[PDB]
Structures are given as structure tokens and as C-alpha cells.
Design an enzyme around this catalytic site. Structure first.
Site, short mmCIF file in Angstrom:
data_model
loop_
_atom_site.label_atom_id
_atom_site.label_comp_id
_atom_site.label_asym_id
_atom_site.label_seq_id
_atom_site.Cartn_x
_atom_site.Cartn_y
_atom_site.Cartn_z
N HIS A 65 -92.45 -26.91 -33.89
CA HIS A 65 -91.35 -27.82 -34.12
C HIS A 65 -91.81 -29.26 -33.92
O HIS A 65 -92.84 -29.53 -33.29
CB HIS A 65 -90.17 -27.54 -33.19
CG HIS A 65 -90.46 -27.81 -31.74
ND1 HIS A 65 -91.10 -26.89 -30.94
CD2 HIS A 65 -90.23 -28.89 -30.96
CE1 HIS A 65 -91.23 -27.38 -29.72
NE2 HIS A 65 -90.72 -28.60 -29.71
N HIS A 144 -94.65 -35.73 -33.92
CA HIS A 144 -95.80 -34.85 -33.86
C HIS A 144 -95.32 -33.41 -33.76
O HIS A 144 -94.15 -33.14 -33.48
CB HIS A 144 -96.68 -35.16 -32.66
CG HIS A 144 -95.98 -34.88 -31.37
ND1 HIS A 144 -95.07 -35.75 -30.82
CD2 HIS A 144 -96.01 -33.80 -30.56
CE1 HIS A 144 -94.58 -35.23 -29.71
NE2 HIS A 144 -95.12 -34.03 -29.54
#
Length: 213
Positions: A65, A144
Site C-alpha cells: 500500500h 512511497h
């Protein structure tokens, strides 16, 4: 009504396997690269070859995720303000494509750099909780996907590490590539920091929602 643990983009099972496999190949290739092996003192600090897949052994469980706002159920600063935004409610459950331009390693974390579209940037928080290393860089630069952490490191460190790498890049401290891997050029930023700039960006499908734990 309490909020999620965090909001973010949750990769589909297929995209998450694709990026997870790409991250493992990168870790294997990097750990075997002569330039990385020569710098191994700049990387570990105690007492052959380091297998980075074992080093970054705390890997995310479930799907991978890309977090937008860590809320801790309402206890984090800015959590309620973020969650009440129109764009957050309008995007909840919506599918997006995340562009991954680079993979990176430091002595603490391994991850994937995400380059957000203008629509995705609308979901990026703006509050006091912003860390200092995000100052001087464009909003959303922290975005990220964590691929792995060292044993005593918390996953949130991955975003701070990426920002620190991008502060090097901002001033050109990446310099010329120290070498090449099959999927892109390899940059040494010193102090155990490494970045693979992908020849071709990776695209992953992900759904924006809230995770509760």
C-alpha cells in the site's frame, strides 16, 4: 465515530505480487553488485555476503500500500481534518494507477518511490504533522510503498528515508550512476543509501480506502 488506522491506496492482489517480486529481485541484484558489496561498512555497523532479503525481513503483510494520511483512529494530528475533506469522501473506494519511478534501500528500509498524479495529489495531506525533511521538496514527495524494514525499524521510517534520498537528488548529490541493473541505473547516495532509477516506470492498480487493523 472513529477513523481508520490510516488512509491510502491499497494495491490489488495482482499488482501487489508484481511489485513485491520486483522488490525482491532488486534486493537480490543489489546485494550482489560489486559497488554495493564494497560499501558494506557504510551499511552495517557490527561484524562474506549480506542477503538483503534477510536483512529487510520485516515485510508488509497483506497487500502492499501507499499511505496518504496516518490517522491512528483519530489520535494523530490532522486526522479529523483530513478525513472530512470532500475529495477523501469522493475518492473512497475509487481505483487509481500509481506510478513507481524508483526503488531504494538504506540501512533502515527498502521501498518504492511513488510519483503521484495531480488528481492523486489532492488526496495528499497538508498539516502540522509534515516532517522537516519534506521541506524544500514538492508536496507528495514522501509518497512511497514500503517493501521491507530492518528488525528494529518502524515502517514509517521508509517515507523519511525516501525524503532524505530526494534531498540528495535535489542538489544533484546522486551524481552519475555508479552502475546498472537490468531494469535501470543504480545510484549511490553515500551512507548506505541506494536508488535504482527505473528505465520504464512501473504502474500498479490500487484502491483508495481506509485500513482499520
Amino acid at each position: 465515530d472513529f477513523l481508520p488506522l490510516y488512509f491510502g491506496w491499497f494495491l490489488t492482489k495482482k499488482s501487489s505480487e508484481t511489485l513485491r517480486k520486483a522488490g525482491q529481485v532488486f534486493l537480490e541484484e543489489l546485494g550482489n553488485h560489486k559497488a554495493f558489496k564494497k560499501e558494506l561498512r557504510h551499511f552495517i555497523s557490527g561484524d562474506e555476503k549480506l542477503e538483503l532479503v534477510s536483512y529487510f525481513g520485516k515485510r508488509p503483510p497483506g497487500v502492499l500500500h501507499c499511505t496518504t494520511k496516518f490517522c491512528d483512529y483519530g489520535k494523530a494530528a490532522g486526522a479529523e481534518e483530513y478525513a472530512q475533506q470532500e475529495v477523501v469522501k469522493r475518492s473512497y473506494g475509487k481505483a487509481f494507477k500509481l506510478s513507481i519511478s524508483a526503488l531504494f534501500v538504506t540501512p533502515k528500509t527498502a521501498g518504492a518511490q511513488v510519483v503521484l498524479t495531480d488528481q492523486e495529489l489532492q488526496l495528499w495531506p497538508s498539516d502540522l504533522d509534515k516532517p522537516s525533511a519534506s521541506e524544500g521538496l514538492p508536496p507528495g514527495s514522501r509518497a512511497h510503498v514500503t517493501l521491507g524494514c530492518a528488525a528494529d525499524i518502524q515502517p514509517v521510517q521508509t517515507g523519511l528515508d525516501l525524503l532524505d534520498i530526494l534531498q540528495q537528488v535535489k542538489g544533484g548529490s546522486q551524481g552519475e550512476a555508479v552502475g546498472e541493473l537490468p531494469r535501470g541505473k543504480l545510484y549511490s547516495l553515500g551512507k548506505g543509501r541506494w536508488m535504482l532509477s527505473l528505465t520504464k516506470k512501473m504502474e500498479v492498480k490500487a484502491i483508495f480506502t481506509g485500513y482499520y487493523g
